[PDB]
């Protein structure tokens, strides 16, 4: 329970660190740590395959593309530090306003089965998977040109 709470609470700090830092490379590192913490949150809800998917697709592949771009477009963004006290508390107040008093539901634990998930992906929800494949094909054809 303490471990679950620590992860749920750490997600917000790892999200704040991304926007606050002025270096695009450092924000990517913070985002990778955020993605791992999201894997860890999904473990508490009972998902292993889905939490694996988040790490494989995002940490494994997407971050590599982001960092490839970041080195290619390398720019001097160490111009100045504008992180005055007045700005940071304003950001925190905005965040508190948005994330307060929303409807909360008891924390669930749900065991998943990739047998059932596979059967549904390829029998009943087969319309979904083929359209996702079409979207991937669109992205491939568009990005390569």
């Amino acid at each position: 329970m303490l471990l679950i709470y620590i992860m749920l609470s750490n997600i917000v700090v790892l999200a704040l660190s991304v926007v606050l830092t002025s270096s695009p490379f450092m924000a990517l590192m913070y985002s990778i740590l955020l993605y791992l913490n999201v894997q860890t949150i999904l473990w508490s809800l009972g998902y292993d395959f889905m939490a694996l998917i988040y790490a494989l697709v995002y940490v494994g592949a997407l971050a590599v593309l982001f960092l490839f771009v970041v080195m290619m477009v390398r720019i001097q963004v160490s111009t100045l530090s504008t992180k005055t006290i007045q700005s940071v508390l304003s950001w925190l107040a905005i965040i508190l306003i948005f994330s307060y008093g929303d409807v909360s539901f008891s924390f669930p634990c749900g065991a998943e089965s990739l047998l059932n998930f596979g059967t549904q992906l390829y029998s009943s929800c087969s319309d979904l998977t083929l359209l996702n494949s079409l979207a991937l094909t669109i992205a491939l054809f568009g990005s390569l040109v």
Partner: protein, 104 residues
């Protein structure tokens, strides 16, 4: 009195904070395009996590499917957007200084 109720409230707070940090973070703290897309990815991950949470809550498979759909669509969008960013930076004229930081 109930740990699950407390954990549910903490999760709601955390996930909402992650979403709002993703959507408004890079624009509030004026950043380059590359950070904007990374924060958009953060927000999409927040929404997909909420759907997985709902699936665990209701013992239903709809959110699992919608989450894999989010992962695919977000990755495709990010790939195309990074293509556009690289092409945009390669066409920059010498006088242009912070081409990527339109939010300046």
């Amino acid at each position: 009195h109930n740990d699950a109720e407390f954990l549910g409230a903490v999760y709601n707070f955390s996930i909402r904070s992650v979403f709002i940090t993703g959507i408004l973070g890079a624009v509030y703290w004026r950043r380059n395009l590359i950070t904007m897309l990374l924060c958009s990815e953060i927000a999409f991950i927040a929404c997909s996590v909420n759907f997985l949470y709902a699936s665990a809550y209701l013992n239903d498979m709809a959110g699992m499917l919608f989450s894999i759909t989010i992962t695919t669509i977000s990755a495709c969008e990010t790939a195309l957007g990074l293509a556009l960013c690289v092409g945009y930076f390669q066409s920059r004229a010498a006088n242009e200084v912070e081409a990527l930081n339109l939010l300046k």
